[PDB]
Amino acid sequence: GVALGATRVIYPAGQKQEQLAVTNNDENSTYLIQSWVENADGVKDGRFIVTPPLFAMKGKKENTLRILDATNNQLPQDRESLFWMNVKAIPSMDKSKLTENTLQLAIISRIKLYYRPAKLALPPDQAAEKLRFRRSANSLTLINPTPYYLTVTELNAGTRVLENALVPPMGESTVKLPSDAGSNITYRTINDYGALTPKMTGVME
């Protein structure tokens, strides 16, 4: 819920500030966008700040967020970094001035944000071609123990078609797989421009 400029956002050596639009589907309801960024842990750490981080707008409008460098914290270079760019978007946050703490109204849009100064020696086109896969009679583990982080969208594994997933940092994720799943894997990915790729082949081992 809420129609932000994208469903996924990238900071390719943003080295100033980037942007993310906000719009709505409905045109009656007003919204209160309340961005915060999180250290992949869902802890809100001001390693990123947003500007305006906090606004109301009328739902059918645009109001862009800009998202700017507040890291400076000795981020790694032997691997990259991943953020969650959470937005509580309340369709008008009335009934939150000391009236209990149980206002359900919160379309938390929960977006993901990549960081990459891209100063790793890993060739970023091949990042998706060294994301390994391990198939089982229940699961398909995504294997991103690589330093770079790329998205895998619409994973096809043998005789089955699977969900979108996101990459954990230098680690493995899992999606559902049947007790059939042939030895072909293919997928689309999100490259650093937000370019959802053509159908590309994929790399189990």
User: Could you tell me the domains of the chain?
Assistant: 2-118 (2.60.40.10), 122-205 (2.60.40.10)
What stretches of 43-192 adopt beta strand conformation (E)? 48-51, 54-58, 65-69, 81-90, 107-108, 111-116, 132-135, 139-144, 151-157, 160-161, 171-176, 185-190
CA pseudo-torsion sign 21, 86, 69, 12: negative
Q: Give the residue carrying structure tokens 């680690």.
A: 171
- What whole-number distance in Å separates Cα of residue 204 and Cα of residue 48? 35
Compute the C-alpha angle 125/196/26, nearest 5°: 150
Cis peptide upstream of residue 76 (ω within 30 degrees of 0): no
Experimentally, the structure was elucidated by NMR
User: Residue type at 77?
Assistant: Q
Q: What is the CA radius of gyration of the chain?
A: 19
Report yes or no: 114 and 82 within 8 Å, Cβ to Cβ: yes
